[PDB]
Design a protein around this motif. Sequence first.
Motif, PDB file in Angstrom:
ATOM      1  N   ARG A  96       0.838  -1.181   0.000  1.00  0.00           N
ATOM      2  CA  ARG A  96       0.000   0.000   0.000  1.00  0.00           C
ATOM      3  C   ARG A  96       0.878   1.238   0.000  1.00  0.00           C
ATOM      4  O   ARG A  96       1.994   1.206   0.510  1.00  0.00           O
ATOM      5  CB  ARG A  96      -0.884   0.004   1.257  1.00  0.00           C
ATOM      6  N   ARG A 103      -5.639  15.964   8.862  1.00  0.00           N
ATOM      7  CA  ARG A 103      -6.315  14.761   9.377  1.00  0.00           C
ATOM      8  C   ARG A 103      -7.042  13.970   8.270  1.00  0.00           C
ATOM      9  O   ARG A 103      -8.047  13.284   8.511  1.00  0.00           O
ATOM     10  CB  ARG A 103      -7.247  15.154  10.523  1.00  0.00           C
ATOM     11  N   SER A 104      -6.496  14.050   7.063  1.00  0.00           N
ATOM     12  CA  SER A 104      -6.906  13.209   5.970  1.00  0.00           C
ATOM     13  C   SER A 104      -5.891  12.090   5.760  1.00  0.00           C
ATOM     14  O   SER A 104      -4.685  12.340   5.773  1.00  0.00           O
ATOM     15  CB  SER A 104      -7.043  14.043   4.698  1.00  0.00           C
ATOM     16  N   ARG A 105      -6.386  10.875   5.543  1.00  0.00           N
ATOM     17  CA  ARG A 105      -5.559   9.700   5.317  1.00  0.00           C
ATOM     18  C   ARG A 105      -6.093   8.872   4.147  1.00  0.00           C
ATOM     19  O   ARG A 105      -7.296   8.700   4.010  1.00  0.00           O
ATOM     20  CB  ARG A 105      -5.558   8.785   6.546  1.00  0.00           C
ATOM     21  N   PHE A 106      -5.184   8.324   3.349  1.00  0.00           N
ATOM     22  CA  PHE A 106      -5.538   7.497   2.201  1.00  0.00           C
ATOM     23  C   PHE A 106      -4.514   6.380   2.032  1.00  0.00           C
ATOM     24  O   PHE A 106      -3.311   6.617   2.012  1.00  0.00           O
ATOM     25  CB  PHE A 106      -5.594   8.332   0.921  1.00  0.00           C
ATOM     26  N   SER A 107      -5.013   5.168   1.903  1.00  0.00           N
ATOM     27  CA  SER A 107      -4.189   4.023   1.584  1.00  0.00           C
ATOM     28  C   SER A 107      -4.578   3.563   0.172  1.00  0.00           C
ATOM     29  O   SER A 107      -5.701   3.122  -0.059  1.00  0.00           O
ATOM     30  CB  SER A 107      -4.441   2.936   2.633  1.00  0.00           C
ATOM     31  N   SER A 109      -3.685   1.164  -3.298  1.00  0.00           N
ATOM     32  CA  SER A 109      -3.032  -0.068  -3.736  1.00  0.00           C
ATOM     33  C   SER A 109      -1.857   0.290  -4.630  1.00  0.00           C
ATOM     34  O   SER A 109      -1.852   1.345  -5.259  1.00  0.00           O
ATOM     35  CB  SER A 109      -3.984  -0.969  -4.522  1.00  0.00           C
TER      36      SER A 109
ATOM     37  N   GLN B 265     -15.924  18.800   0.902  1.00  0.00           N
ATOM     38  CA  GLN B 265     -14.597  18.381   0.465  1.00  0.00           C
ATOM     39  C   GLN B 265     -14.109  17.126   1.164  1.00  0.00           C
ATOM     40  O   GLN B 265     -13.410  16.300   0.554  1.00  0.00           O
ATOM     41  CB  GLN B 265     -13.570  19.507   0.627  1.00  0.00           C
ATOM     42  N   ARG B 269     -13.376  13.762  -0.938  1.00  0.00           N
ATOM     43  CA  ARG B 269     -12.093  13.028  -0.869  1.00  0.00           C
ATOM     44  C   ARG B 269     -12.298  11.553  -0.462  1.00  0.00           C
ATOM     45  O   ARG B 269     -11.776  10.643  -1.116  1.00  0.00           O
ATOM     46  CB  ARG B 269     -11.083  13.721   0.067  1.00  0.00           C
ATOM     47  N   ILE B 272     -13.507   8.942  -3.111  1.00  0.00           N
ATOM     48  CA  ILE B 272     -12.552   8.404  -4.077  1.00  0.00           C
ATOM     49  C   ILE B 272     -12.220   6.942  -3.802  1.00  0.00           C
ATOM     50  O   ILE B 272     -11.995   6.182  -4.730  1.00  0.00           O
ATOM     51  CB  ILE B 272     -11.270   9.254  -4.122  1.00  0.00           C
ATOM     52  N   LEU B 273     -12.223   6.548  -2.531  1.00  0.00           N
ATOM     53  CA  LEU B 273     -11.903   5.176  -2.141  1.00  0.00           C
ATOM     54  C   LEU B 273     -13.119   4.398  -1.599  1.00  0.00           C
ATOM     55  O   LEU B 273     -12.969   3.375  -0.922  1.00  0.00           O
ATOM     56  CB  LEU B 273     -10.739   5.189  -1.147  1.00  0.00           C
ATOM     57  N   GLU B 300      -8.409  -0.496  -0.317  1.00  0.00           N
ATOM     58  CA  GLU B 300      -8.001   0.891  -0.205  1.00  0.00           C
ATOM     59  C   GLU B 300      -8.910   1.537   0.833  1.00  0.00           C
ATOM     60  O   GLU B 300     -10.033   1.101   1.020  1.00  0.00           O
ATOM     61  CB  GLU B 300      -8.080   1.586  -1.560  1.00  0.00           C
ATOM     62  N   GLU B 301      -8.410   2.558   1.518  1.00  0.00           N
ATOM     63  CA  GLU B 301      -9.126   3.148   2.637  1.00  0.00           C
ATOM     64  C   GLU B 301      -8.865   4.626   2.711  1.00  0.00           C
ATOM     65  O   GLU B 301      -7.733   5.059   2.541  1.00  0.00           O
ATOM     66  CB  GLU B 301      -8.663   2.535   3.962  1.00  0.00           C
ATOM     67  N   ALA B 302      -9.911   5.390   3.008  1.00  0.00           N
ATOM     68  CA  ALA B 302      -9.788   6.809   3.285  1.00  0.00           C
ATOM     69  C   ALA B 302     -10.325   7.123   4.668  1.00  0.00           C
ATOM     70  O   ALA B 302     -11.241   6.468   5.174  1.00  0.00           O
ATOM     71  CB  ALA B 302     -10.533   7.618   2.237  1.00  0.00           C
ATOM     72  N   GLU B 303      -9.779   8.158   5.283  1.00  0.00           N
ATOM     73  CA  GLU B 303     -10.330   8.635   6.534  1.00  0.00           C
ATOM     74  C   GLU B 303     -10.177  10.136   6.626  1.00  0.00           C
ATOM     75  O   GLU B 303      -9.126  10.685   6.288  1.00  0.00           O
ATOM     76  CB  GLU B 303      -9.658   7.943   7.732  1.00  0.00           C
ATOM     77  N   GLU B 304     -11.239  10.786   7.099  1.00  0.00           N
ATOM     78  CA  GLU B 304     -11.282  12.229   7.282  1.00  0.00           C
ATOM     79  C   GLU B 304     -11.831  12.512   8.678  1.00  0.00           C
ATOM     80  O   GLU B 304     -12.800  11.885   9.102  1.00  0.00           O
ATOM     81  CB  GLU B 304     -12.202  12.858   6.240  1.00  0.00           C
ATOM     82  N   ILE B 305     -11.176  13.424   9.391  1.00  0.00           N
ATOM     83  CA  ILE B 305     -11.647  13.874  10.694  1.00  0.00           C
ATOM     84  C   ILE B 305     -11.837  15.390  10.610  1.00  0.00           C
ATOM     85  O   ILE B 305     -10.958  16.107  10.116  1.00  0.00           O
ATOM     86  CB  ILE B 305     -10.666  13.499  11.827  1.00  0.00           C
ATOM     87  N   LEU B 306     -12.989  15.858  11.089  1.00  0.00           N
ATOM     88  CA  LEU B 306     -13.363  17.274  11.055  1.00  0.00           C
ATOM     89  C   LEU B 306     -13.803  17.761  12.431  1.00  0.00           C
ATOM     90  O   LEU B 306     -14.512  17.053  13.124  1.00  0.00           O
ATOM     91  CB  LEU B 306     -14.589  17.495  10.157  1.00  0.00           C
ATOM     92  N   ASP B 307     -13.442  18.991  12.770  1.00  0.00           N
ATOM     93  CA  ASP B 307     -14.096  19.716  13.852  1.00  0.00           C
ATOM     94  C   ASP B 307     -15.465  20.203  13.387  1.00  0.00           C
ATOM     95  O   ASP B 307     -15.598  20.892  12.363  1.00  0.00           O
ATOM     96  CB  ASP B 307     -13.252  20.908  14.311  1.00  0.00           C
TER      97      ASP B 307
END
Lengths: 364, 364
Positions: A96, A103-107, A109, B265, B269, B272-273, B300-307
């Motif tokens: 990966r 605080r955005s993350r993407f993995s 392939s 946004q 983002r 996409i995954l 595949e993995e995405a993560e977003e954290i928001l206040d």
Amino acid sequence: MKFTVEREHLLKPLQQVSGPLGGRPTLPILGNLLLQVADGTLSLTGTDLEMEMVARVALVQPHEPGATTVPARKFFDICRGLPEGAEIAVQLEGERMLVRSGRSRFSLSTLPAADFPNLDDWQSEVEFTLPQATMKRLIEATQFSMAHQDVRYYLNGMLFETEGEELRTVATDGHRLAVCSMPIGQSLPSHSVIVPRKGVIELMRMLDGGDNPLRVQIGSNNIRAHVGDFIFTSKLVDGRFPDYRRVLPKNPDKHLEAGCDLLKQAFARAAILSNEKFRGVRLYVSENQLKITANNPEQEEAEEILDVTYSGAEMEIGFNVSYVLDVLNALKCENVRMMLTDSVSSVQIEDAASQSAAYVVMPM
Amino acid sequence: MKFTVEREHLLKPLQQVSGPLGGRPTLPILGNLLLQVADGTLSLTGTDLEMEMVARVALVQPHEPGATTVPARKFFDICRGLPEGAEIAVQLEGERMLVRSGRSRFSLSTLPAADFPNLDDWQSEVEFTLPQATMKRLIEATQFSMAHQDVRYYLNGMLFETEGEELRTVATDGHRLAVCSMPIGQSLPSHSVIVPRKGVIELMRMLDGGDNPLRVQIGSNNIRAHVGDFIFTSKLVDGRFPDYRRVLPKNPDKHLEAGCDLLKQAFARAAILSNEKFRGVRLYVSENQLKITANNPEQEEAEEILDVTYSGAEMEIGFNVSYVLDVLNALKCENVRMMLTDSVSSVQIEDAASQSAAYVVMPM
Ligand SMILES: O=C(Cn1c2c(c3cc(Br)ccc31)CC[C@@H](C(=O)O)C2)N[C@@H](Cc1ccccc1)C(=O)O
Ligand SMILES: [Ca+2]
Ligand SMILES: [Ca+2]
Ligand SMILES: [Ca+2]
Ligand SMILES: [Ca+2]
Ligand SMILES: [Cl-]
């Protein structure tokens, strides 16, 4: 492999190397971009096996060398979709690629970089430099006259010819032709090659319109253009391109000059009532006057009369109005010169103010 | 039939009436515009048998009564291609219509006006007026939630409902719903009709953002809108529409507020995954925090954290991201409010500063 790069340093490189990347990769991995960190530089590569685009990005933040490949579209969209000013931290983690920003993350392939096709090195036989504006002028002047056939068709592409101190483009479909020559101030060997349509599109697309000049290298079967930190390479088309010198009319003695915009507007109106398949219009030339007529199978008729500058013998001649409109729209100038011979011969059209482009259209 | 009118008094009417016609007329004459001179007026009519567009132009120059039909796109293209200020002189000559301006002359084919489909008169049952800006708001607020070619034909349109002093639109595809209400200052009878997709498109298209108010008349099986000297009529969809009041969450105890652009946004983002077919994303809500996650079958993995603004019990809930993004794109406001109940209940989304539009999206 690891790098952190500020978003706006990554965005334009990604856009230039991504596209195309034209929907139908012949190997899955060609849907990926190749990322390579080495000696302080991130190199980004996209290819369809025939053309290749390579961008280099200087790395000012901490980085670790190495390579991988990731899906181009997804990676582009993640970078583009991040906010202005984002710092983009990338690291290879097993199978990966992890992308982190705020605080955005993407993995994503990956597919191994070792499996990414590496196009063979080749030797240039001709090299020259020219302003981007000159390349843009050369392509825009002729591009519309290339044939719209299958990809490998020899006329589905643009002749690039070096002769003396000029670079020349030629494009034709066997019915109409465009040729443009521009001086580049370096004396060049006689050489011509055919760049495929897709290659021509990328040469244009790489022109930002800035200080950066263009450096071109031509080999036996490939062409390479360098601009700023970008390199584009294309295969050439195999074929015997026709000699534009043989299609120019020998003695186009009858010269008509008209305002380009009025001429274009008149042809555009008349075209409406022309045959939808064959698009034929008739020109009647007489002293200081042009009459344009069109008709169609429904018996509808158009007629336009224009004042022009003309004092030769009268003649009547049929043309495909689309071909004539294509030329007038490519000229984008004040006055046009139409150079006529007779009813069974081609016309040569030029900006009245400049001979650096010529257009030849066969009559119907 | 004869008239002469200035290009600038003909162009808008022609665009209004012919614009909607498009390619592929179902019968040949439906590709034509109907022209009628009577009582000092030129009327121009286009139709597809279900909707109809009629514009009236006052004739100040000499004219003669009569009617014919001519190919719509050709006549429009001729009028548009003539220069500004062109006098357009029209004369019927047998089965051809002559069009003359300056030294431009055209002859179009005709079909008899007597053969042009005339839609039946029908009776108005509900009438009101409103500003164009209001109609625009109502349609834009909800249009995206209309079904697309669903077998439940009634979901492919938009409900227009009169209640009190408000006009309301509702649209739903069985998975998500949009409702917008706007006061218009008239005591209205309680009534509702379904306008078909194509009718909604034309209602929007006929708006020009001028001072002309919009005058609406609803019959049992049709609707008409007048703006200035333009009239659009559409059939209604004969069916039973869902009751939006049954779909709004009855008791959405958990309120979350967030910057609309930030939320959009982040979702865009993460999308996409997300699974390309199902587009599922999960939300995890906690104290002044929203976490969004997406993953797809290739791991595949995405993560977003928001206040965000939230005090309430922690919960998780799944949504189709496209449905959420459609709403966020429709809101065009600074802050949004999401009104939540639990993981198995729909969400209601609104602009935090206005309750005039509400959106309901079902969980996954
Ligand atoms: O035979 C010829 C002569 N010819 C040809 C070309 C050409 C260009 C112009 Br502006 C006018 C005449 C041209 C350019 C292509 C030439 C070739 O065979 O490679 C033939 N033309 C065919 C057209 C044609 C030839 C080859 C391929 C497509 C169309 C014809 O008019 O029947
Ligand atoms: Ca290589
Ligand atoms: Ca030349
Ligand atoms: Ca009628
Ligand atoms: Ca409401
Ligand atoms: Cl003109």
